[PDB]
Symmetry: C4
Subunit: 326 residues, 4 copies
Amino acid sequence: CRNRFVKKNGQCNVEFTNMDDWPQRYIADMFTTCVDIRWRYMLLLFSLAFLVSWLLFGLIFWLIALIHGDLENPGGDDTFKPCVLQVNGFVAAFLFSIETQTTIGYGFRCVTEECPLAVFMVVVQSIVGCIIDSFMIGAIMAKMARPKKRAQTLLFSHNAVVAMRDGKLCLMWRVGNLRKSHIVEAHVRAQLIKPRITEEGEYIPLDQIDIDVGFDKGLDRIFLVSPITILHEINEDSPLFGISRQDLETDDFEIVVILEGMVEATAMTTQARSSYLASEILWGHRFEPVLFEEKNQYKVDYSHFHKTYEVPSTPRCSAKDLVENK
Amino acid sequence: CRNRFVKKNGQCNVEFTNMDDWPQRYIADMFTTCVDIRWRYMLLLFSLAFLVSWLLFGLIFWLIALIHGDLENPGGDDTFKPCVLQVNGFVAAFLFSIETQTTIGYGFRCVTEECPLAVFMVVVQSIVGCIIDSFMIGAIMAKMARPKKRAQTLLFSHNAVVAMRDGKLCLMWRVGNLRKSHIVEAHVRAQLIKPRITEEGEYIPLDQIDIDVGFDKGLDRIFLVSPITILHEINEDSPLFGISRQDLETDDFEIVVILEGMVEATAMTTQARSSYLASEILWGHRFEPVLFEEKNQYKVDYSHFHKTYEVPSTPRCSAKDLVENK
Amino acid sequence: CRNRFVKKNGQCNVEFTNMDDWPQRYIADMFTTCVDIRWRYMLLLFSLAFLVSWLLFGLIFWLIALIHGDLENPGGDDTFKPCVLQVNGFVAAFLFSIETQTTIGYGFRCVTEECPLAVFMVVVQSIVGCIIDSFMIGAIMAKMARPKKRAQTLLFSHNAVVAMRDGKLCLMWRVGNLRKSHIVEAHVRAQLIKPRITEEGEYIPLDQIDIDVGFDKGLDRIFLVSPITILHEINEDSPLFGISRQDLETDDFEIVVILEGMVEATAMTTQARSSYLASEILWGHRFEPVLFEEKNQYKVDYSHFHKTYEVPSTPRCSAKDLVENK
Amino acid sequence: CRNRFVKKNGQCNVEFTNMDDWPQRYIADMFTTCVDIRWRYMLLLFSLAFLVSWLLFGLIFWLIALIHGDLENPGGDDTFKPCVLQVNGFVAAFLFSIETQTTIGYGFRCVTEECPLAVFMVVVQSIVGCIIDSFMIGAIMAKMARPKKRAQTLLFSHNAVVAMRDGKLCLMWRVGNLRKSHIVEAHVRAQLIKPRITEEGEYIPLDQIDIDVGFDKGLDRIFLVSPITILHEINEDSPLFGISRQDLETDDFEIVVILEGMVEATAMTTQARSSYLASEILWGHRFEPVLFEEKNQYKVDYSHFHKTYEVPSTPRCSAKDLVENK
Ligand SMILES: [K+]
Ligand SMILES: [K+]
Ligand SMILES: [K+]
Ligand SMILES: [K+]
Ligand SMILES: [K+]
Ligand SMILES: [K+]
Ligand SMILES: [K+]
Ligand SMILES: [K+]
């Protein structure tokens, strides 16, 4: 049995290789790179930026003082005023660099009127400070706000099922929202993933074949409050048209389900994903209800969410047979 | 009479239960959790973060001084310089922690060149400071900018109505914008919400059945300046096709109306919602006008918005009867 | 001649009145309110917030000192240490409040270990400071980034025209981009705006009737590099179907054109708008070219953008006549 | 051979001219202008803003002191207290302006209770400081987050190809994602770019003619994990319908390909673009595979991405011939 293109948790199961021009591409797309790495690397990357700027200006300030001879008389006196009060060592230069760029500015170490190069540096570093701060806030806010994380509160059922609804034979998976905050402009997709050879003898290692779930009358758009059971009507235009309970129980393919919507707070699109191998599809089954009424409101019991119950009355032939007979 | 799936104000009326894996899911989706709680909890959550960092570093600084014996001679002298000038108590350590991380840095309490562990902490805390600040700005900006709040300046009419337009029998609700700022890419949806049993005897506790309002020619897209009256043409493909004034006045169902659009300033999608129980639909009625002209401009009088007037000339049979006769 | 629903610049020409519940709605939707007012009001609103917090804490600090008797001995001595060094007046209390919340912290005026109420306030105010700062950055960034402003670099032609293209009679306006940065997911709409009475004798003060420009094959989606001339094919399904050059030159209606797209940098949707009164439509005309080639690249001369030239060969009857004959 | 409308890298190849009203339009749309210029100009623009504010308030403070006679006795004494301690020069005034607005506030130079004009300025400048800071963060974050940069990690194949698939003759280009982070709501477009003269003898310098790739059944929507090969079915409704291998090898036109999608982290739409001149299209060719299986996962070898292999069995007539015969 051929292994799965996307895992049940939604993760895609492909490795890329021989992209060999990538680090220049990742550099040109640096932000996308940057917000996708691990917090700890993004953070210490920003830490390096601070250290580097702090050392650099510390060093410049130290030079200025070393050369102005302030290391000898740091506090000044009548008839000698240093560039920056109280920079005596390099530690004291670095302290001043930190205190200025952070804008902590304790004051013991302090710029003077004397050297306009000392002043110019405090000006440059103030601006450099803002710049870096700004990159950081931006990076952190972006990373913080990533809507992929919202998929963790959207749930696909563990199994698909096939079964009859209103005279038609249908593939059915279920989706639900685990928060009271909505999924705006929510809509849904599906695809059949098997390899195939064309009549022109072309080999497609994994062709993706649409699994119509209502796009053409906008019935793929959903208003997901309580769980919805999605329906693919298996008919002449479906790629399960001629697939019967028998075929399925020996067949080798994958169904990929996608729910896309906007996280309500940020209106940023999330993409939730899951998958169903042929072997995870329960022919002749139906989902137990979760929605039931109460005096004032309805309620959804999420225990039953994944649970199916068998409908032995269900045809076992393909939907094609089922028409080529009737 | 069965209670309502969504309230008139737009609020959905369902409780979730037996989600029992949720707190790990809410943790993994922490931001979404965080921006959806109540201001006061988000705020004091960020306050805790400050206090905790402030106490923690205060404590570290106190230790360093306690052990360096700075608590005895805080100001230093010739031949003794403490790690941090003027930390004598723990209160004074906490003050220094606050002053550094806030970057207030009054200066009375002040790091020195002496102990590089003192210096390292001021470096770590400066960076930790930025990080936390950044989370806060992000959280607050996000919460601030939530477009759900925009639904408070979009208005649905209190009643639907059925009535005749250009030879066809139509469901009609009304929507309007209460701001001069627009709703971009605005478009609209509707759904019939009743339970139902399938011919395969399946029970759907609340099926959602589309209420076509023009999707197929993009006539669901609106340019909402003055109020628009939305039209569902009740025809063979409608689920009100065979529903007459009589049926309605004893029927039990809910119509759910949605207006989705982008708040102009932020281009973030809002989702406005309301509902109409069968009992809120006025068969044989029509909305009073609100738009009228003036010398230079038009004007909308919002008093008339909700008001209907009866059209006794209106057929009382279903749209099906109305064709199965003619 | 009836005045125009939307001006040429894109501005809508309607006044709202007898919204009388609005200030509570505008309060609940405060952000949307806030970012839509005039810079100077948003700014001084944020200034008030500062002043108010600064006065408030200044006042609290003054009280604390007044009562601790620090106004008498501000600097302290052996055997007396005030809550906050150097607060002697209220001016000095306000200075301390400003210096702390701004985080300037000059230090002359400075909190001590003595009074934990003094300390608690510095803690509260630091956090209050961050909060307000955060609202401000958020507000300012949002206002700054509003994509409506992008419509100022999108241009509609001053006139529509009717004329023949590939055997069909067509309404044609022109759009163009005045920046080298793109308009992503750009697409376009149109509407006929006249009042009308239904056969059921209903009066619609301004009905909006779609002006198909390719929605059904996604031909309303454009890739706007050089100017595009938009086409409404006037055919049996158009509401200009039976409208001839004569009718137009005495008719009374408005055509509203919309171009929606995402500003490239921010991917926020802008909505550009213009209008054409019947009297602004040039029957039997065509736009002069703007695009011409060069050795290496193409070029658009924007002078010709608006200019039409007459095609006297153009039929003068309606597109209906033009078929009811042939 | 006529030069190309859009380069292979995606860049559009048009110059605008005789926009002569533009600088007022670019000013009204200042943000869009601002975030699109070069980092170094955006940055030094913000630097100017600082300098200007710093000089301005420095100057005001200097005046106040000059006139209060503080330049003579800067430190004060019993019976004389200056507006701002220690402003003796203009350098010292500028230092104070910088220290206040940056909020560094070293403290040596320091506002007093004495002059309420001195105090008022520190208040105004604090607020002015925040404002400018806010513009900067906003500008920098926006520029930082531009999703156009994401196109650098989306790849189009260097060549299109024509070839047979499942009985139909098809144009085929290939797209792929170079990151493991997805492209949400990804979908794709295409256009034929040649000049043309209408039967009414109208000259369109570059008409854009849609190249259907599945829009009508939403098959233009893709789930791009491994590379996808896009298909234009060349049939009666295509503008390559009557184009044969011969025509192509002497023809003069350009095909423009677009992939639009949302960068996963930010959910901001990117627009990737490339182009194929008639001369870059390989009649009778097919892409080498890149996807192959492994024990646990699949893998994509990106070396083969661009590589084609000839299928000599491919018809050489147009798809029209190919039907007008059969
Ligand atoms: K400071
Ligand atoms: K300070
Ligand atoms: K969309
Ligand atoms: K500071
Ligand atoms: K200080
Ligand atoms: K269709
Ligand atoms: K700060
Ligand atoms: K944002």
